[PDB]
Amino acid sequence: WRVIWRQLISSVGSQARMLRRSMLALLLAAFMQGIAFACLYPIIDALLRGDAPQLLNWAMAFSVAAIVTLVLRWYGLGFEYRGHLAQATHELRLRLGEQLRRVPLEKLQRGRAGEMNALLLGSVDENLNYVIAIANILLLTIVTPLTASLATLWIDWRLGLVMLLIFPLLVPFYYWRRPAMRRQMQTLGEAHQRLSGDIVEFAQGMMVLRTCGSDADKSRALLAHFNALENLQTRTHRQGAGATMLIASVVELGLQVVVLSGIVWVVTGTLNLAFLIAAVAMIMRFAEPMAMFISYTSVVELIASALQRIEQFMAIAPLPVAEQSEMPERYDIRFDNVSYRYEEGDGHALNHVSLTFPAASMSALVGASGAGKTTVTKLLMRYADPQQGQISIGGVDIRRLTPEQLNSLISVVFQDVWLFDDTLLANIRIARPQATRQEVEEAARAAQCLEFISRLPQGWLTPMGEMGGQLSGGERQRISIARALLKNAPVVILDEPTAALDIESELAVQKAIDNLVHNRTVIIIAHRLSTIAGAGNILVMEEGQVVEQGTHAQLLSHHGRYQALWQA
Amino acid sequence: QVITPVRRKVILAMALAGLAALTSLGALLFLAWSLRDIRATPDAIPAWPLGGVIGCVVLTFVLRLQAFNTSHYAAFHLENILRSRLARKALQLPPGVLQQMGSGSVAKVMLDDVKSLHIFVADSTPLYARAIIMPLATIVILFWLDWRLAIATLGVLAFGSVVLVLARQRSENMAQRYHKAREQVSAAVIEFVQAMPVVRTFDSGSTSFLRYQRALEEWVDVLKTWYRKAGFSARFSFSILNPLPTLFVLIWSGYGLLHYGSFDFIAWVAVLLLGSGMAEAVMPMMMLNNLVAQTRLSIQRIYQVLAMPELSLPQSDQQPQEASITFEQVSFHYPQARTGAALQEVSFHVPAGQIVALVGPSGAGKSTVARLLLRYADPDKGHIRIGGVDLRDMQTDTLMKQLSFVFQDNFLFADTIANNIRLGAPDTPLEAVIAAARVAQAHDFISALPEGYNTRVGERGVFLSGGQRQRITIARALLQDRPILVLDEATAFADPENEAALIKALAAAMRGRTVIMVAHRLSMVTQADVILLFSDGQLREMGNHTQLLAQGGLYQRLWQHYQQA
């Protein structure tokens, strides 16, 4: 069975050899335990009638088998209780971190569920403790009665068939009942998921549901949904329990049926008395690892899903680069016939656009929606390749530049966010990490942030609280302006936060932007009359189709879409 | 012990599984009795003891099945009672302690804690009965069966626990330190995976990845030394719960008793079964202790959730009341963030029928008035006489009736026609519903959506929601009458169509209402009756827009700031 084993040996790392040595040690430990029960056959055969020489012979052979089994089980769990699992999950997390580094950014930027997924791997990678815990229990459950049963096939042959029949009717029949088992768990689960959807709808809009009026209709609807879930759970659980209790008592009914078959073959056939007592011992020995194995049959589902999610995530390939021998001295971003279809939620987010942003001062744009206005800025860092088109920067395609040169060429100024409330020297250092302190003091006063630096305590090495507590919208935006001012990127995308920042800090933010726009291309989307009229080459987009080029004057005197939106 | 839960059904299930374990011991003892009857005389098949064996097996299975059914019914009923009590507590929860504090925590608790309680009860009551009744009855039966070899099987069980407890002389000292290193790496992976979509627009990601790597390589040196502390103890406990040490003690006491006085053989095999049962009964004790610890954790979480809010002081008694909106001496702080005073003695009358657009500092002393109007919280010093009597006698249905909030985000459900229906009147007056969407000028984009007016928008329908959620909820506010309209922030959606269509929709919304348009721009401030200035919780000026402009105070300064951009 390769499709889980090659994943389990690829998603360990450089500890594959010690994992296979520990798997071999635990397989030999379970087989030698089966041989210890085979040595429990002639010990009972000898002790039925005394026989101190035969009892001493097979008791010292049982001492050898028990000591080899316990020492090999100790060496098998040595894989977990040395540092081999620590270094295994460590190398797996430092492979997944670099996979977070070179994943194309639209795959994690695409969905909130996608970012919550990629958030989860570094913390859900802790199940390898469970995958070394399951190995010993499943190996006991399948190997140990197989060795004892194939030992009975040439010690009296009539207990051998039934004891070889009990456990493949247990665990391979468990993995053949895994269709009906996951049917039971999914008949609970899908009802639990629609109830969880009603619960998260209730939990999000609880304020609107309280202050709206339907806290008698929708609330009692949720409560009747709770009662419906409880009745569905009991109505599934009755047949589930009637089927599942026999699965738990497989070893008990197998023990009593071997009792009856041994008794009828003692009084009808051979002298199988001592071998019957030792087989009665054997099956009650096999009782406990199946009693743990049915307690771990959810953890194997969780581990198989986690290994599928890892080896579905680590198969994500980066963006293709080709023949980087370019130095883009000119910054003339000309999208030509770009038609990028985004997802199943938004369709053709652009449709054959023609964009040119050649100015060393500014070239604004306004668009229709999330498709046509900001997904072109998403395309501008090649987050996704266009399904048809070309992205030039001066004269070179953007799929030719390496992401180091590309991500040092252009820089975005965000909405508000990402300082991590540390020393602000480090944040305007992760502007461009080869910066000295004097470069920070030169490029922080040009963003008009130095007065806020002197206003706060501790000087420049100060923590901003727990999330930027003394920093504000208008002060923490000047950090994101100081980052693009220190980085000195000759192309700046500028998501202007003016709609949130206007009445309190539009003076400081506009002064910082006017310091920023000098001698570099700036692409800005905003709604303020200074930014709507007095920008430069102003673009109008409807679902990713460009109209109303040029400045605001000729588009305004054209009396088209821009005059229509500006007149209100 | 615990009395207030469903104790009758779960104590019945616990005692029933305990009697099932006792009759399984009865089945094993009748098996040894039957083999005594067949070894002392090899004869025909023994009727009474083998009938007792098969009867005790089928009684043990039937009893354990009924214990399973009754324990799972107890778990289902306790899960239902807990979800009902959490829903009825969260329905009556003070909303400022709800959306600002634990927006996603309530669904997290109302899924995870109740699933933990179901799983704990249904999977932990037969474990309780087995691990406290099987190894305390096997000791009685073994002491009855043989005076020696119960001391020997207790010796091979207790040698492991003696060496295990004596191994704590080389002490651990690593619960709190390991737990804080675990919390530290689970913070510094979350910080990384949040910093990864952002820092890639900078340099390629090197400093955040180096911080994440050097926060991994400290937690590895905590985890590895924790393993090299717990290694001998856990490997020795996993080697002592193997049946082979118990088998070794039984066999080499079977040879050690052939010399110095032989115990009989069938008493030896009756020791051989029950001693291995008593030896295996240590592991489910550890499993139920593992479940009891984390269940006590989750029950402490459910009790802090159940004890944190108390009903927001509700009274539905007084009246609906006219002369709609005033304040009276309210100076309320913002809870759980600032221990100061987010208002300072705000006192104003408003005659019903006029528009009071108020402006202040960045929503820090401005939007908290709109939070305090809905009774999201109550003032530490003050009374809010909405009409005659204040919100201590609020008549909590009329707060749903009289006040029509419209906020800056306005979360929607997945039934878009009922997203404008299910605010104030759940029914189907669909001609009036499309008329209210017609006069609010949101009928066009909902007419253009694929699944009619009843479009399943969900959470993935970004095109179906769009930037017109304000137009949907304002049309919903035009559906019902609801005299007080409340705008927390309009025109924060800066789209050009939302620049155009929101103004006519609001002009269709301020008809016959005493609104409070808390707007961030000074757009509709010019067309409003009273313009309040705020500055760090203190109200500064009262009066109209042109009166505040003519007096030339700090409103002149703010309007001159706004005339720049």
Automatic annotation (TrEMBL), chain A:
Question: Is Manganese one of the keywords UniProt gives this record?
Answer: no
Q: Which UniProt keywords apply?
A: ATP-binding, Cell membrane, Membrane, Nucleotide-binding, Transmembrane, Transmembrane helix, Transport
One matching Pfam family, short form?
A: ABC_tran
InterPro entries this protein is in? Answer: AAA+_ATPase, ABC1_TM_dom, ABC1_TM_sf, ABC_transporter-like_ATP-bd, ABC_transporter-like_CS, P-loop_NTPase, Type_1_exporter
Gene Ontology CC annotations of this record:
plasma membrane
> What main location does UniProt list?
membrane
Q: Which domain of life is it from?
A: Bacteria
Q: Which PROSITE patterns match?
A: ABC_TM1F, ABC_TRANSPORTER_1, ABC_TRANSPORTER_2
Give the ABC transporter domain ranges.
Answer: 333-568
Q: Where are the transmembrane segments?
A: 24-44, 56-75, 130-151, 157-176, 271-287
Quote one Gene Ontology molecular function term: ATPase-coupled lipid transmembrane transporter activity
UniProt-annotated location(s) = Cell membrane
UniProt membrane topology term: Multi-pass membrane protein
* Domain named ABC transmembrane type-1: residues: 22-302
Protein known as:
Putative ABC transporter protein
Which organism was this protein described from? Escherichia coli (strain UTI89 / UPEC)
UniProtKB/TrEMBL annotation, chain B:
The chain positions of domain ABC transporter read 325-561
Cellular component per GO?
Answer: plasma membrane
User: At the top level of its lineage, which domain of life is listed?
Assistant: Bacteria
Topology in the membrane?
Answer: Multi-pass membrane protein
Kindly give the InterPro entries that the UniProt entry links to this protein. Answer: AAA+_ATPase, ABC1_TM_dom, ABC1_TM_sf, ABC_transporter-like_ATP-bd, ABC_transporter-like_CS, P-loop_NTPase, Type_1_exporter
Read off the Pfam families from this record.
Answer: ABC_membrane (PF00664), ABC_tran (PF00005)
Recite the UniProt keywords alphabetically.
ATP-binding, Cell membrane, Membrane, Nucleotide-binding, Transmembrane, Transmembrane helix, Transport
CDD domains in the cross-refs? ABC_6TM_exporters
The protein's name in its UniProt record:
Putative inner membrane ABC-transporter
Recorded GO molecular functions are: ABC-type transporter activity; ATP binding; ATP hydrolysis activity
ABC transmembrane type-1 domain location: 11-294
Compartment(s) of residence: Cell membrane
Q: Which residues cross the membrane?
A: 10-33, 45-63, 127-145, 151-167, 232-253, 265-288
